[PDB]
Ligand binder design. Structure first.
Ligand code: NA
Ligand code: NA
Length: 246
């Protein structure tokens, strides 16, 4: 894309990042068992294999703590914004925001109290990933749940990182991800007793990192937390139906 587009995207990230709230704002977030939390949402965008434009965007809502799907919606979309590392949210957030608003008007009684986002929050090139960008615009508590480590602010998958993973033992075990300067950007979380590869959790909006990590653990029946896993499944199924794939 033109340099003017990146410059204005950077400025919009800065505008919105100033609205990120990196503390807990709801009583349910400050309770050990999340008393008062009833619905947790999950979001996904998945590209059609062999394509960088056509994709499926999905929103699911699950009951908590039962983790049963109570709402699901998937839509095929065309991601026409250019792809630039550090700016993925500009491709994906428009469609996820539209799904949340459709829910808010169609069935407000099913609105999630928090979203688990397949993507990063403040652990990001500019401290403002998809989870933070979606969180600020929806004004919903949002957690970034990433399956791989984004190597930003001096973070690296190095010998130290691998030894810290070795010392993770069970579901719920976690260690902090410290930016080169001293800002903790997220946590690596072992989400399942039988998997060694952690998830990388960071604040999106309106949650503390400690609470976000605990919520992600509470939502994990398998390695991928249930709201994220169900949104991924919904997108894959919708693509296969829409394109007639066996
Ligand atoms: Na509950
Ligand atoms: Na271990």
């Amino acid at each position: 894309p033109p340099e003017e587009t990146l410059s204005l995207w950077k400025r919009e990230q800065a505008r919105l990042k100033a609205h990120v709230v990196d503390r807990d704002t709801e009583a349910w977030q400050r309770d050990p068992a999340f008393s008062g939390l009833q619905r947790v949402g999950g979001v996904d965008v998945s590209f059609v294999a062999g394509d960088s434009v056509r994709a499926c965007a999905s929103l699911v809502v699950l009951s908590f703590p039962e983790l049963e799907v109570v709402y699901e919606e998937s839509r095929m979309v065309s991601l026409t914004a250019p792809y630039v590392s550090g700016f993925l949210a500009f491709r994906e957030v428009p469609f996820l925001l539209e799904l949340v608003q459709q829910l808010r008007e169609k069935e407000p009684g099913l609105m999630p109290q928090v979203l688990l986002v397949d993507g990063n929050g403040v652990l990001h090139h500019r401290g403002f990933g998809v989870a933070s960008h979606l969180g600020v615009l929806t004004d919903l508590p949002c957690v970034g749940v990433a399956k791989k480590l984004l190597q930003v602010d001096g973070l690296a998958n190095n010998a130290l990182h691998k030894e810290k993973i070795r010392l993770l033992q069970t579901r719920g075990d976690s260690f902090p991800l410290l930016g080169d300067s001293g800002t903790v950007l997220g946590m690596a979380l072992r989400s399942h007793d039988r998997s060694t590869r952690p998830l990388y959790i960071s604040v999106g909006h309106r949650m503390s990192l400690e609470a976000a990590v605990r919520l992600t653990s509470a939502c994990s029946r398998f390695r991928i937390p249930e709201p994220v896993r169900q949104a991924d499944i919904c997108s894959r199924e919708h693509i296969r139906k829409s394109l007639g794939l066996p």
